[PDB]
Design a binder for this molecule. Structure first.
Ligand SMILES: [Zn+2]
Ligand SMILES: [Zn+2]
Lengths: 113, 235, 41, 214, 102, 203, 169
């Protein structure tokens, strides 16, 4: 996504409606600047997350000895040296499935069934 | 004598019955030089429900102050240059959302003047002081380093939410690694200062009698003795 | 393989000099503390 | 049938309770007059669609043959209802006068949700008689009928002045009960009245305790 | 490892009085600069000018609870200081922890 | 009704306070000013099929499937409630339990983006669907109850029983299906104020 | 018998590995009123407990009517099954606050373990008998369990007395 703010007095962008033409506009309440809407989405809540399970996986995630070793095989390079874990979402209501990543691609294949 | 280490990032959740949701703290003290014992409290009122401000506690400030003003009060008044420091991923809408209601809070102060003001020209001048000697006193109290701390204050509010969004558990209060042990050598310091500072202002008394040698070097002898004999450090 | 008498035993980066070094003066003199109810030790 | 078929069915159990209470207190009522099924109840205080008219529910009742033997001056009771979910100082005078003339001694208004603070400040304005107020949602189920709730019983100022004498008790020395206690209200106790409790005991079989109403 | 699990006074304060293990030891106080330098002279682009989107996976480094700028690929920078210590030119007492998972 | 397995449940789900917050996987507020088409593909039809036998603000909700299968519910039901809660000042629409995507559209009837956000919580935390309030989790149990057989002798006649995880009385007493002559909350504190000092003692 | 027991712990280990696999696949249901995590717990506990429970019982009936320790149990003058068990078969699973050894170290019991290790040698299950002499890890866990005991034993000792004093007064 990577949405935007605005130059001149660098602030948050609040949306307003383009009355006479019927369409959405975005603006600022410090100056006057106005740019159209990037997307119709404004806010989302999500009471049953799923984002943040893949939590930062730099390639270096294979030199951290405290991680388990699995001999499966990625959906691309077809290797057999993979590491895994469970969601990093510390939510008492999460589930316990294993996500596996391979040091020779970076997929997120599970073990679930 | 064991004691929870200083200069480290933590985060605690505070019970359903309380106007505050979660809070992060950081004990600061100069690793070499006096060693002030003033801690920084960056609270977060509004529980994980109610319609959620963010306030922090500063030394000598009556009430608490909303993070927004603190940025403008440093030298960064516009947005997006601020989220630069806080968030390291423009695509993390979740985090960003929470912040919205907060910007509106400080929306009433649009510059560095009032920023350093509201903390009750004389105070604004004084404001600076409270930034070079009170605000996060460790790291260094020099001058031209304002920038770095801004990146810190961003990294903190970050570490905060990272927990406040059930992504990282609450900091383990008894994780020995974040605890230190003031052995003999260290003790003879914090004790000494309290003394030497009374010694400082003692030699000040002799000069406040001289209507124009004397130093009874037993007060530094007997003082030390008292403690070690009984077990009462503080003078 | 193994003796049906002895105790059942269950990438490496570091090794333990020796487990019997995690003790301080008190327990250090107790013979076979790994055969008594711990709270007694 | 919708979900209004039930808004009667409940008002009815709340009803039936009153009846039971009126009969347990010590009054007249034929077993039939108590067993007025939900069916033969509906079609009696409803209009067309399904709304209930309370103004037609109110009634009278009187002291059984026995009650006059223990309690002499026990007057006549009067229960009244109102369709106004917030009754006030006006529909009050309709009650305040209605009894001040007929001459009963016991008023029992059944406020749906609540009476006005301006209103109720005219209850001790018709003495000797006394009036009580009971919320609807608190009378759907008779509390005495419950397992743990033992059967109670009042005591004439003779049986009382006896109990006291028989054990040499000084009133204060007697276990108390709150005036606003659910059962105390149910039986319409008063500051000074006694109540005999008879419950089961796993040691002797039956014990007889008494609680006075302060 | 650091404290003995058994030796500790009964009743009252129990567990609030710990005794040190045999191998455990306490630090003394080494110097920061000989490693601060050793950093800002091996790949360490100062914090001052940072760009979160331009510098995605920039590995940030903390010094005694202070943020002395970030660093790009650390893997080598790391296993060099630690080897420098093993020869003994930067006290064996300093601690260096890399939290990749962050 | 003693060993009527489904009758137990049939009352269980009629007492256990269930709120919209426990079934909503997510909620979003898009901008759709045209009450005659959507900016969404899988929504088109649901508009066109709403042209035969107001406000520009839209509100979409993504409910959880398995949570709607557990406590069992219906869009027809769900909404029906909602509608009579607000009444003449909130137009709402919705998909049907059959679909492969559950959705709920709706609109209302000086800065509206602030208000239609305050009405976000009051909808997700002040709107109950089924149950008398404060009574979350409700397990079911088969207890061992000895009892006098008609033939005289006492015998094993186990009967189902419902145990809760919260405490409300005044309401759960007048519930169709219980024996308000045997009901019991372990909160003695309550009981005495409600059932008379005596029953408290017993407890 | 020392063999007959071993394969009742091996099989029980796999009877755990089986339900950990069958859990790291979401192939298990939440015991009503409990969380999937709580329900995860609920089985490991009832598995290890029942194992040790019969583990000892195997020895119990294997100890003739002349065995002194037994005699002192029949006489009723000291100890019970449990005691013998923990000394000749398997000590058992350790636990604090009702739940198996927490994760004080981020996502692991001890640093000598691979993260997210839910097995019993990590959650505090002493498979050894006092007679065989426990492993370091096991020896440690066991203490933390006992440690909890002594705690209240130096609090409930007088707090019950506190609670008492009131009742008296
Ligand atoms: Zn602008
Ligand atoms: Zn691969």
């Amino acid at each position: 996504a990577s949405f935007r703010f605005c130059l001149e007095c660098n602030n948050m962008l609040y949306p307003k409606e383009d009355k006479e033409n019927q369409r959405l506009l975005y603006s600022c309440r410090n100056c006057d600047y106005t740019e159209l809407a990037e997307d119709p989405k404004v806010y989302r809540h999500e009471l049953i997350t799923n984002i943040g399970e893949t939590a930062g996986i730099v390639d270096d995630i294979g030199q951290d000895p405290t991680l388990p070793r699995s001999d499966k095989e990625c959906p691309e390079c077809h290797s057999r040296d993979c590491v895994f874990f469970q969601s990093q979402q510390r939510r008492k209501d999460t589930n316990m499935t294993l996500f596996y990543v391979c040091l020779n691609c970076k997929k997120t294949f599970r073990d679930e069934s | 004598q064991e004691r929870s280490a200083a200069n480290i990032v933590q985060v605690f959740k505070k019970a359903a019955p309380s106007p505050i949701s979660h809070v992060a703290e950081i004990r600061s003290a100069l690793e070499k030089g006096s060693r002030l014992i003033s801690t920084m409290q960056i609270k977060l009122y509004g529980r994980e429900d109610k319609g959620r401000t963010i306030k922090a506690t500063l030394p000598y400030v009556k009430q608490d102050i909303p993070i927004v003003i603190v940025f403008r009060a440093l030298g960064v008044v516009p947005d997006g240059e601020i989220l630069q420091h806080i968030c390291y991923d423009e695509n993390d809408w979740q985090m960003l959302e929470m912040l919205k209601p907060c910007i509106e809070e400080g929306f009433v102060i649009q510059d560095k003047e009032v920023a350093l003001d509201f903390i009750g020209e004389k105070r604004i001048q004084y404001a600076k002081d409270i930034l070079q000697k009170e605000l996060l006193p460790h790291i260094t109290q020099e001058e031209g380093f304002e920038t770095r701390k801004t990146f810190f204050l961003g990294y903190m509010v970050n570490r905060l939410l990272l927990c406040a969004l059930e992504r990282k558990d609450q900091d383990d209060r008894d994780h020995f690694g974040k605890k230190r042990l003031d052995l003999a050598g260290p003790l003879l310091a914090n004790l000494f200062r309290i003394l030497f500072r009374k010694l400082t202002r003692e030699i000040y008394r002799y000069m406040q009698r001289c209507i124009e040698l004397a130093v009874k070097s037993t007060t530094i002898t007997s003082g030390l003795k008292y403690s070690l004999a009984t077990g009462n450090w503080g003078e | 393989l193994n003796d049906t008498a002895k105790r059942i035993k269950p990438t490496f980066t570091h090794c333990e000099i020796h487990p019997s070094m995690i003790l301080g003066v008190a327990a250090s003199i107790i013979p076979f503390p790994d055969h008594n109810q711990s709270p007694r030790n | 049938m919708e979900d209004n078929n039930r808004i009667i069915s409940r008002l009815w159990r709340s009803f039936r309770t009153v009846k039971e209470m009126a009969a347990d207190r010590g009054y007249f009522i034929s077993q039939e007059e108590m067993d007025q099924s939900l069916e033969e109840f509906r079609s009696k205080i409803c209009d067309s669609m399904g709304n209930p008219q309370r103004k037609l529910m109110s009634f009278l009742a009187n002291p059984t043959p026995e009650a006059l033997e223990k309690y002499s001056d026990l007057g006549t009771l009067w229960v009244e209802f109102c369709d106004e979910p917030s009754v006030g100082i006006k529909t009050m005078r309709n009650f305040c006068l209605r009894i001040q003339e007929k001459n009963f001694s016991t008023g029992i208004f059944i406020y749906q949700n609540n009476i006005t603070p301006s209103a109720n400040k005219m209850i001790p304005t018709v003495s000797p008689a006394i009036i009580e107020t009971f919320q609807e949602s608190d009378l759907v189920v008779n509390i005495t009928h419950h397992e743990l709730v033992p059967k109670h019983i009042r005591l004439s100022d003779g049986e009382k002045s006896q109990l006291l004498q028989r054990y040499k008790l000084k009133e204060s020395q007697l276990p108390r009960i709150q005036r606003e206690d659910p059962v105390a209200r149910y039986l319409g106790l008063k500051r000074g009245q006694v109540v005999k409790i008879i419950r089961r005991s796993e040691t002797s079989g039956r014990y007889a305790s008494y609680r006075i109403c302060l | 490892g650091l404290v003995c699990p058994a030796e500790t006074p009964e009743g009252q304060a129990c567990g609030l009085v710990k005794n040190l293990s045999l191998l455990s030891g306490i630090s003394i106080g080494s110097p920061s600069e000989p490693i601060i330098n050793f950093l800002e002279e091996w790949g360490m682009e100062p914090l001052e000018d940072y760009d979160p989107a331009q510098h995605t996976k920039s590995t940030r480094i903390f010094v005694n609870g202070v943020w002395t700028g970030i660093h790009r690929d650390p893997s080598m920078l790391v296993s060099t200081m630690r080897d420098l210590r093993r020869s003994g030119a930067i006290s064996p007492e300093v601690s260096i922890i890399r939290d990749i998972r962050e | 009704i003693a060993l009527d397995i489904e009758k137990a449940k049939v009352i269980q789900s009629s007492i256990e306070y269930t709120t919209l917050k426990n079934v909503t996987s997510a909620t979003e507020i898009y901008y759709d000013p045209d009450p005659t088409s959507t900016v969404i593909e899988e929504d088109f039809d649901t508009v066109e099929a709403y042209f035969s036998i107001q406000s520009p603000w839209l509100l979409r909700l993504e409910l959880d499937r398995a949570r709607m299968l557990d406590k069992q519910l219906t869009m027809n039901q769900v909404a029906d409630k909602i509608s009579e809660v607000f009444s003449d000042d909130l137009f709402v629409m919705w998909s049907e339990d059959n679909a492969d995507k559950l959705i709920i559209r709706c609109r209302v009837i000086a800065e509206e983006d602030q208000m239609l956000k305050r009405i976000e919580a009051h909808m997700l935390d002040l709107i109950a669907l089924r149950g008398i309030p404060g009574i979350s989790k409700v397990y079911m149990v088969k207890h061992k109850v000895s009892v006098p057989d008609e033939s005289g002798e006492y015998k094993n006649e186990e009967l189902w029983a419902l145990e809760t995880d919260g405490i409300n009385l005044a309401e759960v007493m007048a519930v169709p299906g219980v024996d308000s002559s045997r009901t019991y909350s372990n909160s003695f504190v309550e009981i005495l104020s409600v059932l008379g000092i005596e029953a408290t003692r017993s407890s | 018998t020392m063999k007959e027991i071993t394969h009742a712990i091996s099989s029980a280990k796999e009877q755990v590995q089986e339900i950990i696999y069958k859990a790291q696949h979401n192939e298990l249901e939440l015991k009503p009123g409990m969380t999937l995590r709580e329900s995860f717990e609920g089985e490991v506990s009832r598995t290890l407990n029942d194992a040790r429970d019969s583990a000892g019982r195997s020895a119990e009936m294997n100890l003739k009517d002349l065995n002194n320790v037994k005699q002192m149990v029949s006489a009723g003058s000291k100890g019970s099954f449990i005691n013998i068990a923990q000394m000749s078969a398997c000590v058992g699973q350790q636990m604090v606050e009702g739940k198996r050894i927490a994760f004080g170290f981020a996502d692991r019991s001890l640093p000598h373990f691979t993260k997210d290790d839910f097995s019993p040698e990590s959650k505090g299950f002493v498979e050894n008998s006092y007679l065989r002499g426990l492993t370091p890890q096991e020896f440690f866990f066991h203490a933390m369990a006992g440690r909890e005991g002594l705690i209240d034993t130096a609090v409930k000792t007088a707090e019950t007395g506190y609670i008492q004093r009131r009742l008296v007064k």
